[PDB]
RNA sequence: GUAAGUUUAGAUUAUAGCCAAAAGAGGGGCUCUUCUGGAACGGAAAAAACCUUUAAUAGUGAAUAAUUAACAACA
């Protein structure tokens, strides 16, 4: 028996099974090959509806055409004016998707939406838990609000 | 989660901390007009500017704090070596 | 065989990083079921209501009694008898008449 | 002379109560304050409950592909992926093909992470482990 | 403001195309068998 | 507290990578605990140091008076030496300063990923 | 390091704790005296008194704190 030989048993081998990654040099060629084919797919425009993840305010919104998003604050923009969202981290197609690291280049993706309405919120109770609470010890919030309608998503083969 | 790994790479432990994602503007006009600076970003910017001025002032005061010691030693040194007539 | 996960069930997954490294490229074309791995539609020879009538056959004492009727209903749907019992007028009126529907 | 309107103010909030409470001002007033207090507290707890639901759904989706929830999250962070938990649920529900692609990416990073530990750091960073 | 009523909104999102890649169903990720043999089928 | 705690050893210098000469000038301190249920002297020291809010960066000098005050609250703070790879900021660059978690204060923020 | 302090004039209110944890003194568990801390919406099972917790605001965000458990003897 060769040196450093251990017969296989319940405790001799780890429960996990080792795996072997492909060699880097050929692996990069596949990475380049995948990009070239996908670049042709983008050039051919072989996609219909698309979904994109856009971060606005303090929240991340997964977005698609015709989507309506509500932001609970003023934006200083008149209604009916198209605006461009500048924070997109993910865009998807029927048979392919693109992921930012952590964001895509501005050239690749352009997203535009329009302001629909500026409003406030319905009353929100703010009662307090104090001995002898009383019936006239409460507050209302009615925070401001705004409405946005997604308009278009634009991409180009700029890989 | 993941704060420890982010610190190892030198980034902020919380993704919501110091980073282009939070700092950069979140939108721009379709016409191309730049969006107004964010109120939160401006408020955060002001604090950093105030701290920077304090840091420079402290170091300037610190430089004198040690440099002056050398000027008081020169006065002590010259005082020891004295003569007349 | 670059993909680290089996591609034979949902779709072929090809994960690639762009040369610049600023983007991650994923190609996910769907995979169809092989013909040889499927069975033909039953050659020997339909509304769900028809099955319900056959399942809830009227056999004993013409229409069955309330208790047995619930038991037959409970057995078919693997539910408890308590669900089938009616409720009083007070709760019935409370139900909202026109719940909102969007899209 | 307007005590009736004061009663109506309590009544409008107590019309949906049950028993003599809904019709007795002495009891109706007390219930309304308690109901308002309950709603105020529930606002904070509502957000926490939603996060718990999102985590559970992600685990089921991850377990469907054979990946544990902690492993998936850590690999995504190591990959500079900053999707929030709520969005992760949405991707699985409506983009299963994309979610499977995400699962492979996380699995590859975990495999690279295991390889890096076995390598002991002598080997260079992996293609998917480049930061 | 618009004529729309101002009350609690259950969901801040409205979309007419919830799914693009298809909704998940249990048969997703389930492997097929040759001849579509059901489990335990002698055949 | 005995000075031996603050008397370094050769292994400590290697572990923390700090040269015994050219001591660092500025301290970075953040409060990591509450002063509730703590004695009044501990409460007063925290108030004097200005660390009312937890996880708040503060600029302090590495001087004996500051060192003595920090020692009293040592267990409630994290001390990190401030580094200036690019040196002190100028008036023009005063607005471009940013302190990294590594402890280095850059005088120019280019909004480019370190990667 | 930090921003209050001393004096003059007018003037009341308050003047019964509770529990934890230390140091003493009687008993020999208790009985006292002295010092320190506390009053969650989190946690220790429910838990005024122990632990994590700077105020309070909307959000279908994010990072963390305390956190009921723990793995026979031969030389």
From Swiss-Prot, chain B:
Chief location bin: mitochondrion
Comp. bias (Basic and acidic residues): 77-85
Compartments reported by the entry: Mitochondrion
Keyword hit for Transit peptide: yes
GO cellular component labels: mitochondrial inner membrane; mitochondrial large ribosomal subunit; mitochondrion; nucleoplasm
GO MF: structural constituent of ribosome
GO biological process annotation, one example: translation
Keywords, ordered alphabetically: Mitochondrion, Ribonucleoprotein, Ribosomal protein, Transit peptide
Family to which this protein belongs: Belongs to the mitochondrion-specific ribosomal protein mL52 family.
Subunit structure: Component of the mitochondrial ribosome large subunit (39S) which comprises a 16S rRNA and about 50 distinct proteins.
Name of the molecule in the record: Large ribosomal subunit protein mL52
Organism, scientific name: Mus musculus (Mouse)
UniProtKB/Swiss-Prot annotation, chain C:
Origin: domain of life: Eukaryota
Disulfide bonds: none
UniProt key word Ribonucleoprotein: yes
Gene Ontology cellular component annotations, sorted alphabetically: mitochondrial inner membrane; mitochondrial large ribosomal subunit; mitochondrial small ribosomal subunit; mitochondrion; plasma membrane
Keywords: Mitochondrion, Ribonucleoprotein, Ribosomal protein, Transit peptide
GO-annotated biological processes: mitochondrial translation
Compartments, record wording: Mitochondrion
Subunit structure: Component of the mitochondrial ribosome large subunit (39S) which comprises a 16S rRNA and about 50 distinct proteins. Component of the mitochondrial ribosome small subunit (28S) which comprises a 12S rRNA and about 30 distinct proteins.
Protein family according to the UniProt entry: Belongs to the mitochondrion-specific ribosomal protein mL42 family.
Official protein name in the record: Large ribosomal subunit protein mL42
Organism name: Mus musculus
Organism ancestry: Eukaryota, Metazoa, Chordata, Craniata, Vertebrata
Boundaries of the shown chain within the full protein: 34 to 142 of 142
From Swiss-Prot, chain D:
Gene Ontology biological process terms, A to Z: mitochondrial translation; translation
Transmembrane segments: none
Lineage: superkingdom: Eukaryota
CDD domains assigned: Ribosomal_L20
Any GO MF annotation of the entry: structural constituent of ribosome
This protein's UniProt keywords: Mitochondrion, Ribonucleoprotein, Ribosomal protein, Transit peptide
UniProt cross-references to Pfam families, sorted A to Z: Ribosomal_L20 (PF00453)
CC annotations in GO: mitochondrial inner membrane; mitochondrial large ribosomal subunit; mitochondrial ribosome; mitochondrion
Intrachain S-S bonds: none
Coiled-coil positions: none
Intracellular or extracellular location(s): Mitochondrion
Subunit organization: Component of the mitochondrial ribosome large subunit (39S) which comprises a 16S rRNA and about 50 distinct proteins. Interacts with OXA1L.
Family recorded in the similarity comment: Belongs to the bacterial ribosomal protein bL20 family.
Protein name (database record): Large ribosomal subunit protein bL20m
Organism whose genome encodes this protein: Mus musculus
Curated annotation (Swiss-Prot), chain F:
GO-annotated molecular function: structural constituent of ribosome
Signal peptide: none
Top-level division of the source organism's lineage: Eukaryota
Keywords annotated in UniProt: Mitochondrion, Ribonucleoprotein, Ribosomal protein, Transit peptide
Subcellular location: Mitochondrion
A GO term from the CC aspect: mitochondrial large ribosomal subunit
Keyword Signal: no
A biological process from GO: mitochondrial translation
Coiled-coil annotated spans: none
Entry keyword Ribonucleoprotein: yes
Record region (Disordered): 4-24
Similarity-based family: Belongs to the universal ribosomal protein uL30 family.
Subunit structure: Component of the mitochondrial ribosome large subunit (39S) which comprises a 16S rRNA and about 50 distinct proteins.
Protein name per its UniProtKB record: Large ribosomal subunit protein uL30m
């Amino acid at each position: 028996y060769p040196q450093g030989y251990v017969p296989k048993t319940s405790l001799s081998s780890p429960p996990w099974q080792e795996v072997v990654l492909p060699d880097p040099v050929e692996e990069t060629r596949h990475h380049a090959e995948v990009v070239k084919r996908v670049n042709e797919l983008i050039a051919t425009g072989q996609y219909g509806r698309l979904f994109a993840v856009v971060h606005f305010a303090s929240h991340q919104w997964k977005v698609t055409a015709e989507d309506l998003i509500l932001i609970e604050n003023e934006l200083d923009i008149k209604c009916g004016e198209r605006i461009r969202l500048e924070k997109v981290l993910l865009v998807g197609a029927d048979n392919f998707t693109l992921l930012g690291k952590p964001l895509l280049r501005k050239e690749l993706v352009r997203v535009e939406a329009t302001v629909i309405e500026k409003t406030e919120s319905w009353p929100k109770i703010n009662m307090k838990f104090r001995k002898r609470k009383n019936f006239r010890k409460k507050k209302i919030i009615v925070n401001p609000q705004t409405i946005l309608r997604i308009n278009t998503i634009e991409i180009a083969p700029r890989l | 989660a993941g704060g420890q790994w982010r610190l190892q790479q030198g980034l902020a432990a919380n993704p919501s901390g110091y980073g282009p994602l939070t700092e950069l503007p979140d939108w721009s006009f379709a016409d191309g007009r730049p969006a107004p600076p964010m109120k939160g970003q401006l408020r955060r910017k002001a604090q950093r500017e105030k701290l920077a001025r304090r840091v420079v002032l402290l170091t300037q005061e610190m430089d004198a704090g040690i440099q002056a010691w050398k000027l008081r030693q020169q006065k002590l040194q010259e005082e020891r070596k004295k003569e007349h007539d | 065989t670059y993909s680290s996960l089996p591609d034979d069930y949902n779709c072929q997954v090809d994960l690639a990083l762009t040369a610049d490294g600023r983007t991650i490229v994923c190609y996910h074309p769907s995979v169809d079921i092989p013909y040889e791995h499927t069975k033909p539609i039953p050659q020997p020879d339909e509304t769900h209501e028809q099955i319900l009538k056959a399942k809830l056959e009227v056999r004993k004492s013409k229409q069955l009694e309330q208790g047995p009727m619930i038991e037959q209903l409970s057995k078919v749907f693997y539910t408890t008898k308590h669900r089938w019992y009616p409720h009083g007028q007070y709760h019935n009126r409370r139900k909202k008449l026109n719940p909102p529907r969007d899209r | 002379t307007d005590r009736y309107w004061r009663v109506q103010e309590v009544l409008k909030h107590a019309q949906h109560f049950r028993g003599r409470k809904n019709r007795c001002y002495r009891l109706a007033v007390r219930a309304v304050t308690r109901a308002f207090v309950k709603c105020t507290k529930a606002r904070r707890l509502k957000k926490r409950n939603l996060r718990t639901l999102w985590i559970n759904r992600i685990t089921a989706a991850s377990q469907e592909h054979g990946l544990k929830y902690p492993a998936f999250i850590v690999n995504l962070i190591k990959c500079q992926v900053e999707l929030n938990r709520k969005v992760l649920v949405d991707l699985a529900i409506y983009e299963p093909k994309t979610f499977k692609s995400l699962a492979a990416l996380a699995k590859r990073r975990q495999q690279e992470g295991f390889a890096a530990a076995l390598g002991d750091g002598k080997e260079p960073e992996g293609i998917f482990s480049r930061v | 403001q618009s004529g729309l009523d101002v009350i609690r909104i259950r969901k801040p999102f409205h979309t007419d195309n919830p799914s693009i890649q298809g909704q998940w169903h249990p048969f997703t990720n389930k492997r097929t068998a040759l001849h579509g043999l059901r489990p335990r089928e002698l055949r | 507290i005995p000075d031996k705690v603050f008397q370094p050893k050769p292994e400590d210098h290697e572990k923390y990578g700090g040269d015994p000469q050219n001591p660092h000038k500025l301290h970075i301190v953040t409060r990591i605990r509450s002063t509730k249920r703590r004695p009044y002297w501990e409460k007063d020291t925290i108030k004097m140091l200005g660390l009312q809010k937890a996880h708040s960066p503060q600029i302090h000098k590495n001087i004996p008076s500051v060192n003595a005050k920090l020692k009293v609250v040592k267990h409630l703070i994290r001390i990190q030496p401030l580094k200036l790879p690019q040196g002190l900021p100028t008036e023009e660059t005063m607005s471009s300063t940013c302190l990294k978690s590594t402890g280095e204060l850059v005088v120019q923020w280019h909004l480019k990923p370190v990667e």
